[PDB]
Amino acid sequence: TLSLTVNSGDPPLGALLAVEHVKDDVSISVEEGKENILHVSENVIFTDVNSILRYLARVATTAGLYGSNLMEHTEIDHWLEFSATKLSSSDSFTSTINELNHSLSLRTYLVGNSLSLADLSVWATLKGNAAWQEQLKQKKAPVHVKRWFGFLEAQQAFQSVGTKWDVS
Amino acid sequence: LGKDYGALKDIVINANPASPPLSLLVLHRLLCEHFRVLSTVHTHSSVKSVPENLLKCFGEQNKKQPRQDYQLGFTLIWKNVPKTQMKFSIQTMCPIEGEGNIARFLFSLFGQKHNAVNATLIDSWVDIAIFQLKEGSSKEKAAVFRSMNSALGKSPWLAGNELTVADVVLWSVLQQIGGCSVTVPANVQRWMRSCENLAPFNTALKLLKL
């Protein structure tokens, strides 16, 4: 089947959310470990988080996590890179979070009006960003981002992954 | 192939002239081989001057134009942006940032069908070009060469038997890496020459220097 090893000391919440939103469509187990490895088959593994997300989104044609057309696919690519670069730097964070706020002003989900890898990726990255936490507790988080982030966090799949894996 | 699901026509790319996206130029030459493309270069008013080679990177524009005929419109705007950006006529699609993401989109227009594993491999190589090779240490670059050399001993192109966007982006990024000497392994050398032998690859590369 599919097997994901994770770094138990620093879990990839994005990939785990994807495993969570995908488990009803493909058989996949999660193993404790010290790094992230998605074992696809004998000669096939993915080790970087965005590749792991892409692969899971692609084999789970029921969940619709890579969007429903080429343009939504491309938007999801945009957000995957946004979270891995801009949102991972915690450097010029204010400008980066303001870009994210602008994009969410007229959206409920980041892409195509339903949950996608974009949401999982950006959410997971945001949760692990110290500057985001320092913005929330200090009541300075931008309105739309707070609204969208709270929406996802109240979903049962997010609460389940949080409880099991999130190392406070 | 088909291209009319929601028919979009004009592709706009904002790029910084201090950092020309060679992968997009190569891609542009490639699209032109398959589609009737109308190509234009503007300079945004936020940019004072632009090198002549970059002003006319779509110079083989003297050709007679179908005019009625065009399948795709490709507008390159030299602009003071922190990151290469693609925009569409459509309000619903957000601006696409990053040449890797733009390259993925443009190459997809060729219709190449891939399975989950191989599509993801292709995406992986693009990420490696962007997150590791583009701005990595000398050691990070050496590790990329090693991975490429291993892969290229097993298939003629980075993801198998056919040219993919993986080859376009990694080759391009390699050409724009300039500062410190590092040495290229033999399977990578063979693959570079395979790339350079393709008209779209070398003409676009020539554009980058005066």
How many domains of chain A?
Answer: 1
Shape type of chain A: globular
The Rg value of chain A, from CA coordinates, equals: 15 Å
* The first-level CATH class name of chain B: Mainly Alpha
Number of strands of chain A: 4
What gap, in angstroms, lies between the N and C termini of chain B?
Answer: 36 Å
Q: Count of helices of chain A? A: 9
Protein name (chain A): Bifunctional glutamate/proline--tRNA ligase
Subcellular location (chain A): Cytoplasm, Cytosol; Membrane
Organism (chain A): Homo sapiens
Family (chain A): In the N-terminal section; belongs to the class-I aminoacyl-tRNA synthetase family. Glutamate--tRNA ligase type 2 subfamily.
Keywords, please?
heterodimer, A: 168 residues, alpha+beta, Glutathione S-transferase Yfyf (Class Pi), Chain A, domain 2, 4-stranded mixed β-sheet, 4 strands, globular, B: 210 residues, alpha/beta, 5-stranded mixed β-sheet, 8 helices, 5 strands, differentiation (chain B), leukodystrophy (chain B)
Could you characterize the architecture of this molecule?
The complex is a heterodimer of chains A (about 170) and B (about 210). A four-stranded mixed β-sheet of chain A has the order 2-1-3-4. Chain A has nine helices and four strands. Chain A has about 170 residues and is an alpha+beta fold. Chain A has helices at about 15-20, 50-60, 70-85, 85-90, 95-105, 115-125, 130-135, 145-155, 155-165; strands spanning about 1-5, 30, 35-40, 45. The longest helix of chain A has 15 residues, at about 70-85. Chain B has one domain (about 1-210): Glutathione S-transferase Yfyf (Class Pi), Chain A, domain 2, CATH 1.20.1050.130. A five-stranded mixed β-sheet of chain B has the order 2-3-1-4-5, with helices on one face. In chain B, helix 2 (about 50-55) links the parallel strand 2 (about 35-45) and strand 3. The longest helix of chain B is centred in the middle third of the chain and has 18 residues, at about 115-135. Chain B is globular, with a radius of gyration of 17 Å. The chains are: A alpha+beta (about 170), B alpha/beta (about 210). The interface of A and B includes residues 44, 74 and 75 of A.
